[PDB]
Design a protein around this ligand. Structure first.
Ligand SMILES: CCCCCCCCCCCCCCCCCC(=O)OC[C@H](COP(=O)([O-])OCC(O)COP(=O)([O-])OC[C@@H](COC(=O)CCCCCCCCCCCCCCCCC)OC(=O)CCCCCCCCCCCCCCCCC)OC(=O)CCCCCCCCCCCCCCCCC
Ligand SMILES: COC1=C(OC)C(=O)C(C/C=C(/C)CC/C=C(/C)CC/C=C(/C)CC/C=C(\C)CC/C=C(\C)CC/C=C(\C)CC/C=C(/C)CC/C=C(/C)CC/C=C(/C)CCC=C(C)C)=C(C)C1=O
Ligand SMILES: CCCCCCCCCCCCCCCCC[C@@H](O)O[C@H](CO[C@H](O)CCCCCCCCCCCCCCC)COP(=O)(O)OCC[N+](C)(C)C
Ligand SMILES: CCCCCCCCCCCCCCCCC[C@@H](O)O[C@H](CO[C@H](O)CCCCCCCCCCCCCCC)COP(=O)(O)OCC[N+](C)(C)C
Ligand SMILES: CCCCCCCC/C=C\CCCCCCCC(=O)OC[C@H](COP(=O)(O)OCCN)OC(=O)CCCCCCC/C=C\CCCCCCCC
Ligand SMILES: CCCCCCCC/C=C\CCCCCCCC(=O)OC[C@H](COP(=O)(O)OCCN)OC(=O)CCCCCCC/C=C\CCCCCCCC
Ligand SMILES: CCCCCCCC/C=C\CCCCCCCC(=O)OC[C@H](COP(=O)(O)OCCN)OC(=O)CCCCCCC/C=C\CCCCCCCC
Ligand SMILES: CCCCCCCC/C=C\CCCCCCCC(=O)O[C@H](COC(=O)CCCCCCC/C=C/CCCCCCCC)COP(=O)(O)OCCN
Ligand SMILES: C=C(C)[C@H]1Cc2c(ccc3c2O[C@@H]2COc4cc(OC)c(OC)cc4[C@@H]2C3=O)O1
Ligand code: SF4
Ligand code: SF4
Ligand code: SF4
Lengths: 156, 96, 215, 176, 115, 318, 70
């Protein structure tokens, strides 16, 4: 069918643009943020993949939870997640964000940020190296490549 | 001089097996450097070195276009390296 | 906020852009570390001190190890103490790079950060070779250090150390004599020596006010 | 033993005054900063071509966990539970019983990878080199459940990474 | 007539870009998403409250100084007159009084922002 | 056929802005010992296209507490004015030939600030308001000095016609006659375009996003395009003003190439400056413009009024 | 690389070439190829209107030389 071919090509084009231009929110919680900085530094240079930090949630596509999420902080993380225009993605980075980690049995720690927001990629480590975070980012790009919103819409 | 740098560029495009191989490596790895083939993989990955590059750029892999079942012409990742070449590539040892 | 330097909620009262009042609200990174330490053995509590101040990991390990060694009435061997002081100074370099470059980045001078973070990366490699981790090493233990240095680490530390002064020089060329940087830094946040002593300040916050004190 | 960082007085001679006036009006130090950035423009960047190029690592590097075997194919782990006792994050869960041939072996061996701090205390504590932190670090998952490792997953990791793990141990065990 | 066409074209292009931006993508607007942004916590007061101007006197002074550029802008044509001696005296007179205005405001601490 | 000319001016400007962004990232990266975009396309040549396609397919957000009419009008005004400032520029022939082209650019640049003002106010958020008020202070700082500098320089031209500037500099660049004015003009263009070290309105480290903090998707993309088109336009104006290319009426493309090369040199100098200096404080910007630039500018205005009469050097036009 | 910045600068330069060259070519095309007449003052406009009147085809650009003097 011609229509199916057209929606497939438009799907690929949109998927390509989104993966290519991923803007994470300038947002860091704890130790893991330091490795995030090392991903932006010369050695790795995330900017060369089209990945640039932007402070505003309105101009951001990706949230990287890089650090422990405490109970006091969870409403603010949820709020800045909700202020991201869609499509939006969340990368959970480090043991603390993934499941609580070293502070899993604390009265003031959220046992995993996926209780608060939906997570796309879980990056293990304490902290994950800058290379491991880069691997997770490229995995998120690969996942975005697989999405077929237009094909799904056409089939409806 | 500048002309010798241009000649280096032309021997770099000549050194990748022609213009189409040059374009393949440029669009597959965003790099067109020429190095000594250290070895090959049982899965098709090729491993090169160039000790005149600074530490970090002196060893690299051109990944296979066809891993176990999936097409990897564009979709490559660091997890495709087998453990022995993983040890060599991350400079844990000097011996391939 | 990029300028927040972490999970800090600073509530400010402002008249125009003038700051009438600062109310720092903290606790957004309170993890209950001390109770958790009360639930661990002395060796199990050591990796918490890595994660207290995540830019000076081995210094925190050293402070905790000194406390426990004092309580145990034992003595680390001389080679361990030399290793500890060497890695404490490397860690001080790491921390000072992070502090100066993030301060410049807030001010607006974004470039020196990228120049200095390659050096930070080279020191992370030193950390990793000795312990297997670029950050939370857990190398310094209440008895000395966990493992002996690998057989070629001193040479690489020497090679790094004989080039770093030029990088500091480039940083100083960028910042020290710039009139914009001096306008953003001279006479800002002036604290007197007596106020610094009473408020509990330590380190540079004392030494900038002329107090002659280094532990 | 101390030095002063800002206790220098400026010369008041006419030549000095004219040099400072030239600095103020013609912006000499700003041109110095421009020269420094221009110098860095012509250097080779320190960037590496990831994933084609990798960052250097060490035999002591702590990565994904694995359970090892003896050369006969028999598992090394004997269920002493020292790794479970030492783990500061309580990330290890162990259940054991006598095997059909009377051997002391585990029936449950879990590591919660989202609890783990990757400290390496368990491989220090293991008396038979059964649990190791292998060299791998590229194991990001798309779901949280994939990071809850059981004994099958860890034995598979050991089987998959033994060639590199043994070579890493051979290069570091004399420092241990 | 050409300039009117140019202005219409530019405004039409910008408005079409806004219309595409608002009608092409999928919108999922909800109350949490549209709430005002203040770094993760809800704002204390209104953003429509009085916001003090500390440079208020420079702003009033800018009004008078801006009108003096209107008086100095015809100077290129005034240099073509035969009474160059009268013209130059008037041009310099206007710039001297302009500088004197700045000197008075500067010395009387008028250029300092209120604290 | 005039419509074809309008399109032939508009579309290439937008393409140059899109690639200017790629150029800034690459220049800043290499100045910071890294590479910048080099994956999305060869040498990152497709990165601007991916950025544009991403921004025009993402969800535009209208704030709940905002005023919609101004909120939507402001980016339209910004982009349309940025495109309109190009029409009187002679390269070497202008699309629109004006007797007072300099005054036209002055007035439209003055009107361009209201995009930032109305955007910040209509967002109805505190950071946007702080950015808008910083724009107010910035305009107050630079406007008088910029106008007087332009007048002092154009006392050598004899008119406000932009094409006459080509004839004036037939033998020598005007920067050899008025370099003290050129320095202050360059700094005032940095302030007027909200560029570092004078980029107070965005205030990224300080105010997160400044005036457009509440803008997303396409409207934010329009603000970004307007700002970069203004960078190019102001540098082209400076190149025409101070570094006058020689024009052969039978081979105008030589002038076009020379002028474009000079404009690129000045824009690259803007990007070079952004990577070298810390940000000003906005009251310090006001004090710099009012206590240093203004007295020198007044004195040099008197000097440039007196000098042609002193040496019998008055230019031709009425 | 630093010479990898050059492709983007070349694209931008090519884009910035187009407006001036296009304006020159369109001026030549619509003005008879002899350059667009400039009318800053009413005397030049009067000359243009006289040219249009005497051109016999209502085009200012068409020029009548000494072949109209019998
Ligand atoms: C003579 C009569 C003139 C009639 C004007 C048109 C008819 C009135 C309605 C159209 C305008 C308002 C549209 C609207 O309210 O949609 C709400 C609608 C839904 O509202 P809602 O969210 O349910 O309610 C929210 C609240 O009401 C909260 O809403 P709000 O607070 O945002 O509402 C404010 C709005 C509400 O409307 C009113 O209050 C009544 C209308 C009064 C407008 C006239 C005031 C005088 C202004 C000066 C004269 C301008 C020329 C007019 C004559 C032109 C003749 C050719 O008033 C305005 O802001 C109109 C401003 C337009 C001025 C354009 C000037 C551009 C300046 C450029 C710089 C200068 C260039 C050099 C010269 O939202 C939208 O449709 C999406 C955005 C729509 C705005 C698009 C841009 C504006 C439309 C073009 C206006 C004219 C531009 C030329
Ligand atoms: C210190 O970090 C930072 C950087 O460094 C990495 C930056 O670069 C940076 C600047 C922002 C960059 C990420 C650049 C962003 C690129 C733009 C937003 C894309 C704009 C391109 C389009 C909207 C232009 C239109 C697209 C068309 C192809 C043009 C033609 C138009 C048709 C009608 C034809 C910031 C803010 C930053 O903070
Ligand atoms: C007049 C025009 C109006 C519309 C203008 C819109 C802009 C024109 C369209 C521009 C499209 C250019 C983008 C496509 C480039 C694809 C790049 C290519 O390399 O992607 C490959 C795959 O290509 C994509 O699957 C398809 C991209 C194109 C899809 C069809 C595009 C059709 C365009 C039709 C335009 C229609 C406009 C409709 C509105 C009018 C895989 O690469 P990737 O895996 O990432 O690489 C990872 C990094 N590695 C390689 C180093 C590891
Ligand atoms: C580069 C600058 C110039 C561009 C040049 C092209 C200009 C493009 C025009 C700009 C608009 C772009 C919008 C593209 C998507 C279409 C949106 C809308 O127009 O379509 C629907 C219009 O349909 C409406 O439901 C009404 C349909 C019928 C009611 C009134 C229409 C009467 C016309 C009669 C049609 C019958 C056949 C006519 C044959 C000629 C509205 O659906 P809606 O969900 O809200 O909007 C979201 C669109 N999504 C889904 C793609 C995300
Ligand atoms: C200024 C530079 C860039 C200018 C902009 C040019 C963009 C051109 C490329 C556009 C690519 C096609 C647009 C596709 C994205 C549109 C939004 C979208 O993806 O929505 C998908 C949506 C999914 O919704 P549902 O399946 O029904 O259920 C979801 C509810 N739970 O499905 C759709 O609506 C897709 C409909 C077809 C889109 C039309 C594309 C046509 C091309 C647009 C050209 C624009 C010209 C003006
Ligand atoms: C394509 C389909 C055409 C539909 C036309 C609809 C137009 C309209 O007003 O709708 C508002 C529309 C859609 O909003 P939603 O309902 O929330 O989402 C729609 C998705 N379902 O919002 C918009 O995009 C508004 C677009 C701006 C209007 C364009 C005209 C504005 C004129 C501005 C003039 C002033 C210019 C200022 C500078 C010039 C000065 C020299
Ligand atoms: C907005 C204000 C726009 C200002 C336009 C000025 C343009 C200009 O200066 O060109 C002057 C030009 C030529 O004059 P000179 O070259 O100097 O000498 C004549 C000999 N050839 O004169 C003209 O062509 C005048 C043409 C009419 C002026 C245009 C008026 C536009 C008014 C905009 C109204 C738009 C709608 C109203 C509301 C807008 C938004 C709601
Ligand atoms: C025979 C009669 C001749 C008539 C006299 C001619 C000779 C005149 C000699 C003096 C000319 C000096 C002109 C310079 C004007 C500004 C000088 C100045 O004082 O400004 C500085 C500040 O100005 C700056 O430094 C600007 C800061 C921002 C810098 C941004 C980038 C730096 C510029 C890059 C290169 C510029 C290239 C410009 C030319 C471009 C080509 C058009 C003052 O500030 P402070 O040092 O803080 O001290 C005053 C309060 N105590
Ligand atoms: C923007 C670039 C090039 C770098 C700098 C940077 C990031 C990402 C995130 C942040 C950041 O710097 C700011 C300011 O300084 C710290 C210091 C921190 O601790 C040292 C910390 O931990 C949460 C967070 C921050 C900010 C932060 O979130 O990439
Ligand atoms: S996972 Fe580890 S490194 Fe990351 S924030 Fe938590 S304790 Fe710090
Ligand atoms: S590495 Fe540390 S936290 Fe992880 S399982 Fe071993 S002992 Fe527990
Ligand atoms: S892995 Fe080692 S320490 Fe843990 S139970 Fe088995 S034998 Fe004991």
């Amino acid at each position: 069918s011609r229509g199916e071919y057209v929606v497939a090509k438009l799907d690929d084009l949109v998927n390509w643009a989104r993966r290519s231009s991923l803007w994470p929110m300038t947002f860091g919680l704890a130790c893991c943020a330091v490795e995030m900085m090392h991903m932006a530094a010369p050695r790795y240079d995330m900017d060369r993949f089209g990945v640039v930090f932007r402070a505003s949630p309105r101009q951001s596509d990706v949230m990287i939870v890089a650090g422990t999420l405490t109970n006091k902080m969870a409403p603010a993380l949820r709020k800045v997640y909700d202020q991201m225009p869609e499509p939006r993605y969340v990368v959970s980075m480090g043991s603390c964000a993934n499941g609580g980690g070293y502070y899993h049995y604390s009265y003031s720690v959220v046992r995993g940020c996926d209780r608060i927001v939906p997570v796309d990629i879980y990056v293990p480590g304490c902290p994950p190296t800058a290379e491991a975070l880069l691997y997770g980012i490229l995995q998120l790009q690969r996942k975005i490549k697989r999405e077929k919103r237009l094909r799904i819409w056409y089939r409806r | 001089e500048l002309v010798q740098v241009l000649r280096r560029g032309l021997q770099q495009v000549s050194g990748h097996g022609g213009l189409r191989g040059y374009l393949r490596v440029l669009f597959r790895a965003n790099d067109v450097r020429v190095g000594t083939l250290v070895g090959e993989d049982k899965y098709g990955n090729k491993y090169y070195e160039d000790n005149k590059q600074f530490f970090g750029r002196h060893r690299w892999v051109i990944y296979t276009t066809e891993m176990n079942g999936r097409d990897t012409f564009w979709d490559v990742d660091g997890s495709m390296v087998p453990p022995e070449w993983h040890r060599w590539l991350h400079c844990m040892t000097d011996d391939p | 906020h990029p300028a927040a330097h972490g999970v800090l909620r600073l509530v400010m009262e402002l008249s125009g852009e003038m700051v009438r009042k600062c109310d720092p609200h903290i606790g957004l990174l309170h993890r209950g570390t001390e109770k958790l330490i009360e639930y661990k053995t002395y060796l199990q509590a050591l990796p918490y001190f890595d994660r207290l101040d995540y830019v000076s990991m081995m210094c925190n390990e050293q402070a905790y190890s000194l406390a426990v060694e004092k309580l145990l009435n034992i003595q680390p061997p001389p080679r361990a103490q030399w290793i500890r002081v060497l890695f404490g100074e490397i860690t001080r370099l790491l921390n000072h790079i992070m502090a100066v470059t993030t301060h410049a980045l807030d001010i607006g001078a974004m470039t020196p950060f990228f120049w200095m973070f390659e050096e930070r990366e080279k020191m992370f490699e030193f950390y990793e070779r000795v312990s297997g981790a670029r950050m939370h090493a857990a190398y310094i233990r209440p008895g000395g250090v966990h493992q002996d240095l690998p057989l070629g680490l001193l040479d690489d530390i020497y090679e790094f150390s004989k080039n770093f002064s030029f990088r500091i020089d480039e940083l100083e060329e960028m910042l020290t004599n710039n009139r914009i940087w001096r306008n953003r830094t001279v006479d800002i946040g002036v604290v007197t020596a007596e106020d610094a002593l009473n408020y509990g300040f330590s380190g540079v916050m004392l030494r900038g006010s002329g107090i002659q004190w280094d532990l | 033993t101390y030095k002063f960082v800002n206790m220098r007085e400026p010369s008041m001679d006419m030549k000095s005054v004219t040099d400072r006036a030239a600095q103020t009006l013609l912006w000499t130090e700003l041109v110095r900063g421009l020269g420094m950035t221009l110098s860095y423009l012509f250097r080779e960047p320190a960037t590496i071509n990831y994933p084609f190029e990798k960052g250097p690592l060490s035999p002591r590097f702590r990565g994904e966990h694995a359970l090892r075997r003896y050369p006969s194919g028999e598992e090394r782990c004997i269920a002493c539970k020292l790794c479970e006792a030492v783990c500061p994050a309580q990330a290890i869960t162990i259940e054991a019983e006598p095997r059909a041939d009377g051997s002391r072996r585990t029936t449950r061996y879990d590591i919660d990878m989202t609890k783990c701090i990757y400290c390496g205390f368990c491989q220090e504590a293991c008396p038979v080199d059964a649990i190791v932190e292998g060299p791998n670090f590229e194991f990001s998952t798309e779901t949280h459940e994939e990071l809850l490792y059981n004994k099958e997953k860890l034995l598979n990791n050991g089987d998959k990474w033994e060639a590199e793990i043994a070579a890493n141990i051979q290069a570091d065990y004399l420092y241990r | 007539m050409n300039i009117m066409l140019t202005l219409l074209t530019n405004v039409t292009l910008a408005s079409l870009l806004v219309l595409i931006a608002f009608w092409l993508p999928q919108l999922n607007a909800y109350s949490e998403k549209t709430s005002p942004y203040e770094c993760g916590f809800d704002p204390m007061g209104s953003a429509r409250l009085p916001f003090s101007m500390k440079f208020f006197l420079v702003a009033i002074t800018f009004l008078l100084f801006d009108l003096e550029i209107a008086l100095l802008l015809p100077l290129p044509w005034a240099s073509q007159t035969n009474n160059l001696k009268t013209m130059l005296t008037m041009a310099l007179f206007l710039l001297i009084l302009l500088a004197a205005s700045l000197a008075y405001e500067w010395t009387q601490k008028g250029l300092e922002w209120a604290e | 056929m005039f419509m074809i000319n309008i399109l032939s001016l508009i579309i290439p400007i937008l393409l140059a802005v899109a690639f200017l962004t790629l150029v800034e990232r690459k220049v800043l990266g290499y100045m910071q010992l890294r590479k910048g975009p080099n994956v999305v396309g060869p040498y990152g040549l497709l990165q601007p296209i991916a950025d544009a396609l991403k921004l025009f397919t993402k969800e535009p957000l209208r704030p709940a507490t905002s005023s919609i009419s101004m909120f939507i009008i402001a980016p339209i005004l910004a982009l349309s004015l940025a495109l309109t400032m190009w029409v009187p520029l002679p390269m070497p022939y202008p699309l629109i030939n004006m007797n007072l082209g300099v005054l036209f650019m002055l007035a439209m640049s003055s009107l361009a600030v209201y995009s930032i003002l109305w955007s910040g106010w209509a967002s109805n958020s505190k950071y946007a308001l702080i950015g808008a008020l910083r724009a107010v202070a910035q305009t107050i700082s630079y406007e008088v000095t910029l106008a007087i500098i332009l007048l002092s320089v154009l006392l050598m031209n004899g008119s406000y016609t932009l094409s006459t500037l080509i004839t004036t500099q037939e033998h020598i660049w005007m920067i050899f006659t008025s370099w003290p004015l050129a320095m202050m003009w360059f700094i005032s263009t940095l302030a007027e375009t909200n560029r570092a070290p004078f980029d107070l309105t965005e205030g990224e480290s300080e105010l997160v996003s400044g005036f457009n903090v509440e803008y997303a998707a396409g409207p934010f993309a329009m603000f970004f395009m307007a700002e970069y088109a203004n960078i190019i336009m102001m540098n082209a104006f400076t190149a025409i003003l101070f570094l006058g290319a020689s024009h052969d009426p039978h081979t105008p493309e030589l002038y076009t190439i020379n002028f474009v090369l000079k404009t690129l040199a000045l824009t690259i100098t803007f990007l070079w400056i952004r990577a070298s200096y810390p940000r000003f404080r906005y009251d310090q910007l006001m004090h710099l413009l009012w206590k240093s630039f203004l007295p020198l500018t007044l004195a040099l205005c008197m000097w440039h009024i007196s000098l042609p009469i002193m040496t019998a050097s008055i230019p031709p036009q009425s | 690389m630093w010479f990898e910045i050059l492709p983007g600068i070349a694209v931008m330069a090519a884009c910035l070439f187009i407006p001036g060259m296009a304006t020159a070519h369109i001026h030549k095309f619509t003005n008879g190829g002899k350059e667009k007449r400039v009318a800053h003052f009413s005397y030049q406009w009067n000359l243009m209107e006289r040219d249009r009147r005497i051109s016999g085809v209502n085009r200012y650009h068409v020029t009548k030389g000494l072949e109209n003097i019998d």
